Write a protein that binds this ligand. Structure first.
Ligand SMILES: Nc1cccc2c1CN([C@H]1CCC(=O)NC1=O)C2=O
Ligand SMILES: [Zn+2]
Length: 105
């Protein structure tokens, strides 16, 4: 249980060692304007994504960060968001926990 892969195709995405306690917890539960609930795990680092378009501050769940949609680079599954433009850290990833599969290295 040390590597996280995309659930739909297996693409390598992150590691348990890279989880990031933002404001006290790596886990944050949030809703978007369409009412969807997301269990977001915060990671300092991720790979194998494709970040779409340019950042937006609108509706941001994390104060002072702007977001871009992060898709699985391989299969295009929406995996979460990349956050940037803030402070300590300047950037991180918010990944949707049930879209990942956890497993050995
Ligand atoms: N405006 C809009 C319309 C439909 C879906 C969604 C949004 C904005 N958003 C997310 C983007 C990431 C964030 O930090 N907060 C959100 O709310 C969505 O998942
Ligand atoms: Zn995938």
């Amino acid at each position: 249980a040390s590597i996280f892969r995309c659930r739909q195709c297996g693409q390598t995405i992150s590691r348990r060692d890279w989880l990031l306690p933002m404001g006290g917890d790596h886990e944050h539960v949030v809703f978007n304007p369409a009412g969807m609930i997301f269990r977001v795990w915060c990671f300092s680092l991720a790979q194998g994504l494709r970040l779409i378009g340019a950042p937006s501050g609108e509706f941001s769940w994390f104060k002072g960060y702007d977001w871009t949609i992060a898709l699985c680079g391989q299969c295009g599954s929406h995996l979460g968001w990349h956050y940037e433009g803030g402070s300590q850290p300047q950037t991180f990833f918010g990944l949707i926990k049930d879209r990942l599969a956890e497993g050995p290295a």
